[PDB]
RNA sequence: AUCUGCUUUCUCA
RNA sequence: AACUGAGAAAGC
């Protein structure tokens, strides 16, 4: 993972993000982080920013349909809706089985 | 520097070569047909 | 060649054994299979080389066009083996092939050699642009110290250097970006751009970089010069009996100049204090002292720093006193104060009792560190106040930590909870304060935890700060933040015009440390600034050379033979407390030998140097009594009155005097009756021999008992093992 | 105030 | 069928 991150950073000439990210976007030529929470998405987004701030874009998804993306809207709402539906399905199944 | 990792040498080599091929293609070092050959070889690997 | 590498990987995976090796072996286990070797390596490479050189083709060629340029045979000499066994065999060549390549082979480019071995080229430049002084033959006391082998311009810890090398040469597979990757970003980028146009092997470049960066420190015997530029020539600098003056080329850091200047000033003062009119001798020596290649006066003028000794020498030489101190990253200037250093069994937080150097009295210092300034007021083991100015967070933290350590606050000592070593693996004494500073620079959390916090100042300008380096509501106890000519006495005492002593010779640190640079003394009596063993050997050699005249004067003269320059220099290594007692004891013994017919020449030589200081007899008017006269420096530097000593032993059988390991001969300066003469009359002051071991008297009486005897009272004295005698007052 | 990557050779144990 | 530990040196 670190090899991929450093290779992409060198190729695109962007300073290496100090922490291992989740994905790298060629179109944006940047990094994308994914933090899956269960409460407010904005609070977890701010918590992530307090340590990262401007290192890379942040995407936050919550099982309660609450989300928080970066300042740039790139993905269409279809994928966001699909991800939210998948998370809601997982949460509902876990709660039904008393696993939540 | 000694390379660390609990994963197979083949896995590390394949991922490194895939990243190198993708960077070469994006930067234009490698031709599109050469990139296709590299991707096919890696897939069969 | 990503596509070619992928094709090679597919080709290798076409082999089942290689396929399973790659699949099963992990990345960590690669390091194991890299060392796989079915056949054990031979263990006599010298014999193997002598055997192979007497063969046809011991060398192995590298397949390619360059190997093809080598002719099969040259003038009937088969350079390389025939190529009829190409199939999975390999190729070989003779050393004659190497010579042929060096003679007629293609002319390549040397830029790679210049780049890779730039360190050795700099070493050669330092050697060539260097001047040699004169070789001096005489005793040299070398101390084993951990010194840097080669000079460096940016020395970094090995892990930091390894990370820098990985960033420079392997940016992609470098791992996590660490602190080093940031604090050395400029150097990493500069090296990457410089190494961009290079086809040299990456591993060779990495070793070049580590040679340029990593510091190789080894334990070596050094004598007055420990700078790496001197360590690389140590083999020529000096031995156990000779010393070559050497002036290395290249630029020298001013830190080494300051350290060598401090050492030189301390030596000058230590040699001058015992002299009559110490100021005159101190000035005379300082005017003929050279630090590496510059006079001491110029170094003192041009160095904005030093210690008490440097200030004293500056005042003696006419330069202004720069009352500045260095405590690592911290630089201080004594605004005002006064304190006498003492050794205190300080209890450390982790239950360790150490004889740490503690200062007493109110003292104020204009302190600075990095880009931050402040004023530190302190007392005995307490930080009275610390008013710091606004600056960078890291610089402010460094200043606060260093001031805490400097103040020797009791909380600071109690704040040590961890592994702290005040003694090196060789048993040499590390500076306790500097070790505490090093510990607290990194593990600073506990120091602030135990320091305590009080209410932040509410004054007009004073606002306090906390561990976050922000103006928090609570401040560190005793710490506040704000946004806003001498004369020297004969005895080397610095006095203001008012009449107050500000610094004195007694305030000079007694530590005897090797100079960073080579200190030279361009005076005939340059050995008088040497170590204890060197001084002892030189003084006794002077006594031996002038033994005839010294003895004649002693038999004829009464008191004029006890005053000499050599003995004055020898006095500088006798502690002041015991100097007078030693003088009284030795003078009494020599006079008792002279007045009677008992004249042990070896004892006369042994005790004569100690008869220089003014006698300090006991309260009853009788001289003290000693078994060993302990000299300054080291536990083995002492003279045994009766037995032999590491610094002075006598062999009557061969009449050979072993002083500091050097054997002189008294054959020629001796009386054959001396061997029969009893040693008991040259051991105790005011004691003569009367007979053999007398059982009636009792057991051997010690020094305390012997001093309390009355006149005409016999006692048993053990001159040495197996030699008891009976002595009287 | 200097202490806080391996292989081979030689010495020592 | 050339081991263990330590030290120094050299090479990668
Ligand atoms: O290399 C040694 C010494 O020569 C060197 N040193 C000392 N001073 C300087 C300067 N000014 N420039 C460059 N190098 C310098 O550092 C090593 C110190 O060894 P040593 O001589 O043993 O130091 P000392 O015996 O003086 O005790 P130490 O705690 O190390 O202090 C050295 C220096 O700092 C002064 N100092 C320390 N403390 C805690 C002091 C204090 O509480 N109060 C006062 N007035 N001074 C304090 C020492 O007096 C020296 O000035
Ligand atoms: Mg993660």
From TrEMBL, chain A:
<feature type="binding site">
    <location>
        <position position="34"/>
    </location>
    <ligand>
        <name>Mg(2+) 1</name>
    </ligand>
</feature>
<feature type="binding site">
    <location>
        <position position="33"/>
    </location>
    <ligand>
        <name>Mg(2+) 1</name>
    </ligand>
</feature>
<feature type="short sequence motif" description="Nuclear localization signal 1 (NLS1)">
    <location>
        <begin position="38"/>
        <end position="53"/>
    </location>
</feature>
<feature type="binding site">
    <location>
        <position position="33"/>
    </location>
    <ligand>
        <name>Mg(2+) 3</name>
    </ligand>
</feature>
<feature type="binding site">
    <location>
        <position position="33"/>
    </location>
    <ligand>
        <name>Mn(2+) 1</name>
    </ligand>
</feature>
<comment type="function">
    <text>Plays an essential role in viral RNA transcription and replication by forming the heterotrimeric polymerase complex together with PB1 and PB2 subunits. The complex transcribes viral mRNAs by using a unique mechanism called cap-snatching. It consists in the hijacking and cleavage of host capped pre-mRNAs. These short capped RNAs are then used as primers for viral mRNAs. The PB2 subunit is responsible for the binding of the 5' cap of cellular pre-mRNAs which are subsequently cleaved after 10-13 nucleotides by the PA subunit that carries the endonuclease activity.</text>
</comment>
<comment type="similarity">
    <text>Belongs to the influenza viruses PA family.</text>
</comment>
<comment type="subunit">
    <text>Influenza RNA polymerase is composed of three subunits: PB1, PB2 and PA. Interacts (via C-terminus) with PB1 (via N-terminus).</text>
</comment>
<feature type="binding site">
    <location>
        <position position="22"/>
    </location>
    <ligand>
        <name>Mg(2+) 1</name>
    </ligand>
</feature>
<feature type="binding site">
    <location>
        <position position="22"/>
    </location>
    <ligand>
        <name>Mn(2+) 1</name>
    </ligand>
</feature>
<feature type="binding site">
    <location>
        <position position="22"/>
    </location>
    <ligand>
        <name>Mg(2+) 2</name>
    </ligand>
</feature>
<feature type="binding site">
    <location>
        <position position="34"/>
    </location>
    <ligand>
        <name>Mn(2+) 1</name>
    </ligand>
</feature>
<feature type="binding site">
    <location>
        <position position="22"/>
    </location>
    <ligand>
        <name>Mg(2+) 3</name>
    </ligand>
</feature>
<feature type="binding site">
    <location>
        <position position="22"/>
    </location>
    <ligand>
        <name>Mn(2+) 2</name>
    </ligand>
</feature>
<protein>
    <recommendedName>
        <fullName>Polymerase acidic protein</fullName>
    </recommendedName>
</protein>
Automatic annotation (TrEMBL), chain B:
<comment type="subunit">
    <text>Influenza RNA polymerase is composed of three subunits: PB1, PB2 and PA. Interacts (via N-terminus) with PA (via C-terminus). Interacts (via C-terminus) with PB2 (via N-terminus); this interaction is essential for transcription initiation.</text>
</comment>
<comment type="function">
    <text>RNA-dependent RNA polymerase which is responsible for replication and transcription of virus RNA segments. The transcription of viral mRNAs occurs by a unique mechanism called cap-snatching. 5' methylated caps of cellular mRNAs are cleaved after 10-13 nucleotides by PA. In turn, these short capped RNAs are used as primers by PB1 for transcription of viral mRNAs. During virus replication, PB1 initiates RNA synthesis and copies vRNA into complementary RNA (cRNA) which in turn serves as a template for the production of more vRNAs.</text>
</comment>
<comment type="similarity">
    <text>Belongs to the influenza viruses polymerase PB1 family.</text>
</comment>
<protein>
    <recommendedName>
        <fullName>RNA-directed RNA polymerase catalytic subunit</fullName>
    </recommendedName>
</protein>
TrEMBL record, chain C:
<dbReference type="Pfam" id="PF20952">
    <property type="entry name" value="Flu_PB2_7th"/>
</dbReference>
<keyword id="KW-1190">Host gene expression shutoff by virus</keyword>
<keyword id="KW-0506">mRNA capping</keyword>
<dbReference type="GO" id="GO:0044423">
    <property type="term" value="C:virion component"/>
</dbReference>
<dbReference type="GO" id="GO:0003723">
    <property type="term" value="F:RNA binding"/>
</dbReference>
<dbReference type="GO" id="GO:0039694">
    <property type="term" value="P:viral RNA genome replication"/>
</dbReference>
<keyword id="KW-1157">Cap snatching</keyword>
<keyword id="KW-0946">Virion</keyword>
<comment type="function">
    <text>Plays an essential role in transcription initiation and cap-stealing mechanism, in which cellular capped pre-mRNAs are used to generate primers for viral transcription. Recognizes and binds a wide range of cap structures of target pre-RNAs which are subsequently cleaved after 10-13 nucleotides by the viral protein PA. Plays a role in the initiation of the viral genome replication and modulates the activity of the ribonucleoprotein (RNP) complex.</text>
</comment>
<dbReference type="Pfam" id="PF20948">
    <property type="entry name" value="Flu_PB2_2nd"/>
</dbReference>
<dbReference type="Pfam" id="PF20951">
    <property type="entry name" value="Flu_PB2_6th"/>
</dbReference>
<feature type="domain" description="Influenza RNA polymerase PB2 sixth">
    <location>
        <begin position="521"/>
        <end position="674"/>
    </location>
</feature>
<dbReference type="Pfam" id="PF20950">
    <property type="entry name" value="Flu_PB2_4th"/>
</dbReference>
<feature type="domain" description="Influenza RNA polymerase PB2 second">
    <location>
        <begin position="39"/>
        <end position="107"/>
    </location>
</feature>
<dbReference type="InterPro" id="IPR049110">
    <property type="entry name" value="Flu_PB2_2nd"/>
</dbReference>
């Amino acid at each position: 993972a670190w090899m991929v991150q450093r290779s992409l950073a060198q190729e695109h000439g962007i300073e290496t993000p100090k922490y291992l990210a989740d994905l790298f976007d060629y179109k944006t030529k940047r990094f994308i982080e994914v933090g899956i929470t269960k409460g407010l998405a904005d609070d977890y987004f701010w918590k992530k920013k307090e340590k990262l701030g401007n290192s890379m874009e942040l995407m936050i998804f919550s099982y309660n349909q609450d989300y928080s993306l970066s300042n740039e809207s790139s993905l269409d709402e279809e994928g966001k809706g699909r991800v939210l539906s998948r998370l809601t399905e997982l949460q509902a199944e876990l709660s039904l089985k008393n696993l939540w | 520097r000694k390379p660390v990792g609990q994963h197979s040498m083949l896995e590390a080599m394949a991922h490194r070569l895939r990243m190198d091929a993708r960077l070469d293609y994006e930067s234009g070092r490698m031709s599109k047909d050469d990139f296709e050959k590299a991707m096919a070889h890696l897939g069969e690997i | 060649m990503t596509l070619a590498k992928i094709e090679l990987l597919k080709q290798l995976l076409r082999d089942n054994e290689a396929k399973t090796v790659l699949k099963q072996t992990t990345v960590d286990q690669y390091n194991i299979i890299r060392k796989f070797n079915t056949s054990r390596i031979e263990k006599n490479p010298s014999l193997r080389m002598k055997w192979a050189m007497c063969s046809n083709f011991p060398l192995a060629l590298t397949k390619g066009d360059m190997a093809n340029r080598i002719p099969l045979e040259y003038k009937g000499i088969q350079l390389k083996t025939n190529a009829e066994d190409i199939g999975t065999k390999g190729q070989m060549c003779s050393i004659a092939a190497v010579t042929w390549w060096n003679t007629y082979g293609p002319i390549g480019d040397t830029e790679g050699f210049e780049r890779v071995y730039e360190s050795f080229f700099l070493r050669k430049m330092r050697l060539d642009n260097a001047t040699w002084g004169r070789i001096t033959f005489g005793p040299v006391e070398r101390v084993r110290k951990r010194v840097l082998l080669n000079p460096l311009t940016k020395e970094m810890p090995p892990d930091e250097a390894s990370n820098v090398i990985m960033e420079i040469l392997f940016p992609k597979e470098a791992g996590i970006p660490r602190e080093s990757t940031w604090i050395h970003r400029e150097l990493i980028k500069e090296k990457r751009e410089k190494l961009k146009g290079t086809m040299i092997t990456p591993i060779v470049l990495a070793y070049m970089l580590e040679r340029e960066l990593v510091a190789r420190r080894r334990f070596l015997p050094v004598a007055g010069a420990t700078s790496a530029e001197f360590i690389e020539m140590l083999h020529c600098l000096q031995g156990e009996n000779w010393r070559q003056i050497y002036h290395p080329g290249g630029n020298k850091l001013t830190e080494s100049r300051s350290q060598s200047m401090i050492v030189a000033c301390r030596k000058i003062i230590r040699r001058s204090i015992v002299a009559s009119n110490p100021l005159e001798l101190a000035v005379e020596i300082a005017n003929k002292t050279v630090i590496d290649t510059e006079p001491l006066k110029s170094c003192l003028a041009a160095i904005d720093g030093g210690d008490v000794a440097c200030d004293i020498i500056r005042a003696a030489l006419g330069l202004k006193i720069r009352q500045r101190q260095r405590f690592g990253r911290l630089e201080l200037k004594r605004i005002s104060g006064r304190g006498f250093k003492n050794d205190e069994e300080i209890l450390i937080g982790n239950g360790t009792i150490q004889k740490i150097g503690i200062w007493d009295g109110e003292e104020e210092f204009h302190v600075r560190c990095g880009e931050c300034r402040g004023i530190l007021k302190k007392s005995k083991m307490k930080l009275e106040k610390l008013l710091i100015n606004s600056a960078k967070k890291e610089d402010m933290r460094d200043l606060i930590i260093l001031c805490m350590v400097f103040s020797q606050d009791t909380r600071m000592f109690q704040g040590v909870r961890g592994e702290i070593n005040f003694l090196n693996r060789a048993g040499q004494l590390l500076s306790p304060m500097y070790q505490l500073q090093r510990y607290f620079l990194n593990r600073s959390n506990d120091l602030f935890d135990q320091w305590g916090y009080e209410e932040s100042p509410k004054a007009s300008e004073l606002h306090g700060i906390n561990e976050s380096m922000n103006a928090s509501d609570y401040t560190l106890k005793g710490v506040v933040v704000t946004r806003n000519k001498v004369s020297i006495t004969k005895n080397l005492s610095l006095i203001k015009r008012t009449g107050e002593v500000i610094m004195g010779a007694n305030d000079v640190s007694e530590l005897e440390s090797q100079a960073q640079l080579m200190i030279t003394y361009d005076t005939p009596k340059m050995w008088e600034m040497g170590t204890t063993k060197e001084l002892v050997q030189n003084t006794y050699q002077w006594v031996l050379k002038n033994l005839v005249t010294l003895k004649a004067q002693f038999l004829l003269g009464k008191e004029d033979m006890f005053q000499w320059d050599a003995f004055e220099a020898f006095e500088s290594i006798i502690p002041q407390k015991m100097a007078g007692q030693y003088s009284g004891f030795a003078r009494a013994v020599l006079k008792q030998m002279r007045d009677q017919e008992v004249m042990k020449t070896d004892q006369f030589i042994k005790l004569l140097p100690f008869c220089f200081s003014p006698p300090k007899l006991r309260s009853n008017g009788e001289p003290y009594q000693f078994l060993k006269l302990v000299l300054k420096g080291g536990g083995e530097n002492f003279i045994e009155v009766r037995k032999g000593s590491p610094l002075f032993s006598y062999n009557p059988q061969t009449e050979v005097l072993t002083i500091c390991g050097r054997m002189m001969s008294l054959k020629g300066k001796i009386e054959d009756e001396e061997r029969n003469r009893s040693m008991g009359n040259a051991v105790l002051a005011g004691f003569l021999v009367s007979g053999k071991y007398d059982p009636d008297l009792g057991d051997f009486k010690t020094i305390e008992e012997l001093e309390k005897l009355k006149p005409g009272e016999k006692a048993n004295i053990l001159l040495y093992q197996g030699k008891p005698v009976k002595v009287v007052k």
